[PDB]
Each structure stands twice: as C-alpha cells, then as structure tokens.
Amino acid sequence: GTLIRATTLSRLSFIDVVNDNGFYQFEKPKEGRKYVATLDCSEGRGQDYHALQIIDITEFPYKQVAVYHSNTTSHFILPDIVFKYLMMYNECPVYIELNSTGVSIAKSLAMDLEYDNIICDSFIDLGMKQSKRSKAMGCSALKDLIEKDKLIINHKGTIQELRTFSEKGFHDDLVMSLVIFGWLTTQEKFAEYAGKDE
Numbered sequence: 001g002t003l004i005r006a007t008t009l010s011r012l013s014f015i016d017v018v019n020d021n022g023f024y025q026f027e028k029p030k031e032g033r034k035y036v037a038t039l040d041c042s043e044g045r046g047q048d049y050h051a052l053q054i055i056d057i058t059e060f061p062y063k064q065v066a067v068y069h070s071n072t073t074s075h076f077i078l079p080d081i082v083f084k085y086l087m088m089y090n091e092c093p094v095y096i097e098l099n100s101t102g103v104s105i106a107k108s109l110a111m112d113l114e115y116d117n118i119i120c121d122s123f124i125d126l127g128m129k130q131s132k133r134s135k136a137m138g139c140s141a142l143k144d145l146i147e148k149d150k151l152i153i154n155h156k157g158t159i160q161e162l163r164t165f166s167e168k169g170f171h172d173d174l175v176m177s178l179v180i181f182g183w184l185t186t187q188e189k190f191a192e193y194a195g196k197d198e
C-alpha cells in the first residue's frame with residue numbers, strides 16, 4: 001500500500017553520485033533554467049534528516065537536479081548552507097515547511113542573509129504553514145507527477161524512501177520534502193516560479 005504504485009516504483013533508477021558532505025548534485029545549474037527548492041528540516045530529538053530538494057521547473061518533465069540531505073549539520077550553519085545552494089541554482093526560490101526549525105531557518109534567510117526569494121504562504125508565514133491538508137494534497141500531487149513521468153528522480157536515498165512510503169499516515173524526510181514540492185505545484189503562485197522568463 002505504497003503511495004507510488006508498484007510498477008512505477010520498480011522502474012525508478014538512480015545515478016550514484018558522490019556525497020559531498022550531504023550535497024548530491026545530478027545536474028549543474030544552467031543559464032536560463034528556473035528551479036525551486038523545498039526544505040523539510042529535522043526537528044527536536046530523533047532520527048530525522050534535513051532534506052532540501054532542488055527541482056528544475058523550467059518545463060516538463062521536472063527534474064531533481066540536486067539534494068542536500070544531512071543529520072550532522074551544525075544548527076548555526078544550516079541557513080548558510082541552504083543559502084549557498086539557493087544562490088547556486090540561479091537564485092532559486094525556497095519553500096520551507098514551518099516546523100520550529102523551519103521558522104528559524106526562514107527568518108535567518110530573510111533577516112540575516114537578506115535572501116529575497118523566499119516563497120511565503122502569508123506575510124507572517126515565511127514558508128509552508130503546517131497543515132494536514134497540505135500533506136495529503138501534496139502527496140496526491142507528487143504521486144501523479146511521478147506516475148506520469150512528469151518529475152524525474154535521480155537520487156538513491158530518495159528512491160529508497162519512496163519504495164517504503166505508505167499511502168496513508170524508515171526515514172521519510174526526502175519524500176516529505178518532495179511532498180512540499182507537490183503541494184506547491186497545486187498553488188496559484190507556482191506560475192511565478194515555473195517556466196522560462198518571458
């Protein structure tokens with residue numbers, strides 16, 4: 001009872017890139033392409049990882065071009081690491097799940113690093129406000145993208161997590177960061193970020 005149907009899961013495949021201290025790069029940034037990054041931060045104590053997914057949304061199919069995945073990042077430096085990769089991907093907009101750590105990272109990006117491509121649900125929510133409906137609808141959107149071959153997955157750990165991710169409520173941070181992306185794609189504001197500049 002996986003979210004992604006078995007035949008699709010069986011055809012997923014990864015490019016086995018070297019881990020650069022948590023950063024996995026499948027495509028370099030390219031001129032004229034438009035990206036988005038989604039961030040699922042770990043919170044509190046336990047066995048979870050921070051997961052930043054960077055997706056090329058210039059045109060279909062969308063592509064997973066890089067991932068940052070770590071549970072050994074110093075809290076003091078996580079905003080600077082995210083900022084580095086957003087700047088790399090053509091000053092990438094970012095959509096952060098606003099758990100306690102995500103609220104702090106979003107504020108650091110806005111106030112300390114002065115990054116001005118933060119996707120915000122509202123003036124007081126500097127990212128994706130937590131809700132149950134955003135998870136469910138983001139999962140449905142992600143299922144359709146992967147099953148219709150409209151989102152290409154390259155990363156080994158992401159595929160491993162997709163193969164065990166249940167259709168209802170093992171690590172899942174790489175999938176949950178893709179669920180944030182799926183939810184974004186259902187919103188009116190996604191048209192501000194997707195597509196070539198006109």
Ligand SMILES: [Mg+2]
Pocket residue numbers: 040041042043048049050051173
């Ligand atoms: Mg997490």
